[PDB]
Amino acid sequence: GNFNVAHGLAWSYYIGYLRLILPELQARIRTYNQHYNNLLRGAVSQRLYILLPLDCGVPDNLSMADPNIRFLDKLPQQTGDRAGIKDRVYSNSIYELLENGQRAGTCVLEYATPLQTLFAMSQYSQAGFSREDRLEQAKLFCRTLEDILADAPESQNNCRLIAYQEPADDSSFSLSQEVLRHLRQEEKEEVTV
Amino acid sequence: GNFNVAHGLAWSYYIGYLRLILPELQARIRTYNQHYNNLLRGAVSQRLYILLPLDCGVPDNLSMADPNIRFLDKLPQQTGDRAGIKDRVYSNSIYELLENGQRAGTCVLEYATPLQTLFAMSQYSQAGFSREDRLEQAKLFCRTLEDILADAPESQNNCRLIAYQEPADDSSFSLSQEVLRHLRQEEKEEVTV
Numbered sequence: 001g002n003f004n005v006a007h008g009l010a011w012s013y014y015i016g017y018l019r020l021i022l023p024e025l026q027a028r029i030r031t032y033n034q035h036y037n038n039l040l041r042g043a044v045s046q047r048l049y050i051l052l053p054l055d056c057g058v059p060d061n062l063s064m065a066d067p068n069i070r071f072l073d074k075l076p077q078q079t080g081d082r083a084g085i086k087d088r089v090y091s092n093s094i095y096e097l098l099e100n101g102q103r104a105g106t107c108v109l110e111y112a113t114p115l116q117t118l119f120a121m122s123q124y125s126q127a128g129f130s131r132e133d134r135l136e137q138a139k140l141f142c143r144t145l146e147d148i149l150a151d152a153p154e155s156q157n158n159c160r161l162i163a164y165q166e167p168a169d170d171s172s173f174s175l176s177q178e179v180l181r182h183l184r185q186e187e188k189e190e191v192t193v
Numbered sequence: 194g195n196f197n198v199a200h201g202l203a204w205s206y207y208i209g210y211l212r213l214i215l216p217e218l219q220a221r222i223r224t225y226n227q228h229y230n231n232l233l234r235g236a237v238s239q240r241l242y243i244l245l246p247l248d249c250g251v252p253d254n255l256s257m258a259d260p261n262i263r264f265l266d267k268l269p270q271q272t273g274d275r276a277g278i279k280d281r282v283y284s285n286s287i288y289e290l291l292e293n294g295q296r297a298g299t300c301v302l303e304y305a306t307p308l309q310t311l312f313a314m315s316q317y318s319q320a321g322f323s324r325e326d327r328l329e330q331a332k333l334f335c336r337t338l339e340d341i342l343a344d345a346p347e348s349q350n351n352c353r354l355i356a357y358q359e360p361a362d363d364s365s366f367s368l369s370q371e372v373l374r375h376l377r378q379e380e381k382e383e384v385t386v
C-alpha cells in the first residue's frame with residue numbers, strides 16, 4: 001500500500017541536514033572566492049551540487065565515478081563563532097570538472113546520502129524491497145526533495161539537484177558532462193536575467 | 194494520497210543507525226560492566242533504551258527532564274578495526290536512575306533522534322504539518338520501528354522502546370520511574386528465562 005520511505009527520507013535530509021548547512025556553505029564559498037579567485041582563474045559556484053544517481057550507487061570517493069571529476073581544494077571553515085552552528089559534518093571539498101585534461105568548471109559537489117538507505121534497504125531481504133521499489137523511491141525522493149527546496153527559504157538558490165539514470169547498456173556515461181551542463185546553464189541564467 | 198514521513202524516518206533510523214550500533218553494543222556494555230562491577234558493584238543493562246516521547250520533545254540534556262536520571266559516563270567504543278566494524282564513533286551515554294537519592298538502576302539511554310525531525314517539521318510552516326499531525330506520525334514512527342525490530346536479526350533483543358504520552362494537565366509523570374519499570378522488568382525476564 002501507501003508506503004513511501006522516500007517521503008520521510010527527503011524531509012529528513014532537508015530538516016536535519018541541508019537546512020542547517022546551506023547558509024554556512026554559501027558564506028564559506030563566497031569568502032573562498034574573495035581570497036582565491038586570482039589563484040582559481042574562475043569562481044566556485046555558490047550552489048551546492050547534489051548528485052542523485054537513480055541507481056542509488058554512492059561511492060566513498062567521487063573520482064571512481066568519473067576520472068574527469070577530480071578533487072581540487074578544501075573549503076575553509078566558519079570563523080570562530082562556535083555558537084551552535086557546527087552540528088553536522090559536511091564536505092569542505094571543491095571539485096574541478098575536466099574536459100580533455102583541461103579544467104572546464106569548479107563546484108562543491110556531494111552525493112545525496114539518503115540514496116544509500118534505499119540501496120541498503122534493497123539488499124535487506126526482510127524489508128521486501130525490490131530493485132524496482134528502489135528506483136521508484138529514488139525518483140520519488142528527487143521529486144519530493146525538489147518540491148521542498150522550491151518553497152524553502154533562499155535554499156532553492158543554494159543548491160542544485162543532479163538526478164540521473166545511467167545507460168542500461170554500458171555506454172561510457174559522463175557524470176562530469178552532466179555536471180558541466182548544469183554549471184553552464186547556471187552561469188547563463190545568472191547572466192541573462 | 195498518504196504522506197507518512199514516519200515510514201521513511203523509521204526505516205532510516207534502523208538502516209542508518211540502529212543496524213550499525215546494536216550488533217556491537219552488548220560487547221561494549223559487557224566490558225564496561227567488568228569495571229563497573231569491580232569498582233562500584235554496578236551493572237548496566239544490556240539493552241539500548243530508546244526514549245520516544247510522543248510529544249517529540251527532545252532536550253539536549255536528559256537530566257533537565259529528570260534529575261533522577263543522572264549522567265554517569267560515556268560508553269567506550271569497540272576494538273580491533275581501525276575503521277570501526279560498523280561505526281565511526283557513536284556517542285552513547287550511560288545514566289543512573291535514582292529513587293529517593295539512591296541508585297536504583299543503570300542503562301544506556303537516549304532519545305529517538307527522528308522525533309526532533311517531526312518536531313522541527315511542525316514548526317516549519319511550508320510543511321503544512323500541524324502538531325496533531327506530529328503526534329499521529331510519532332505514533333506511526335513507534336509502530337513502524339517496532340515492526341522492523343521484530344523481523345530484525347537479534348536487534349530486537351538489543352534494545353527496548355520506551356514510548357510515553359505525557360498527561361496534558363501537567364500531571365506527575367516520572368520519566369525515571371517509567372525507565373525503572375522497564376529495567377526491573379528486564380531483570381525479571383533475564384532471571385526467569
Ligand SMILES: Nc1nc2c(ncn2[C@@H]2O[C@@H]3COP(=O)(O)O[C@H]4[C@@H](O)[C@H](n5cnc6c(=O)[nH]c(N)nc65)O[C@@H]4COP(=O)(O)O[C@H]3[C@H]2O)c(=O)[nH]1
Nearest residue numbers: 012013016017088089090113114205206209210283306307
Ligand atoms: N553528507 C551528510 N549527510 C548527513 C549528515 N547528517 C545527516 N545527513 C543526512 O541526512 C539524513 C537525516 O539525518 P538525521 O535527521 O540527523 O536523522 C538521523 C538520526 O535521526 C539517526 N542517526 C544517525 N546517526 C546517529 C547517531 O550517531 N546517534 C543518534 N542518536 N542518532 C543517529 O538516524 C537518522 C538517519 O541517519 P542517516 O541514515 O545518516 O541520514 C541522514 C543523512 O543521509 C552529515 O553530517 N553529512
Ligand SMILES: [Ca+2]
Nearest residue numbers: 053055057166
Ligand atoms: Ca553509478
Ligand SMILES: [Ca+2]
Nearest residue numbers: 246248250359
Ligand atoms: Ca515531554
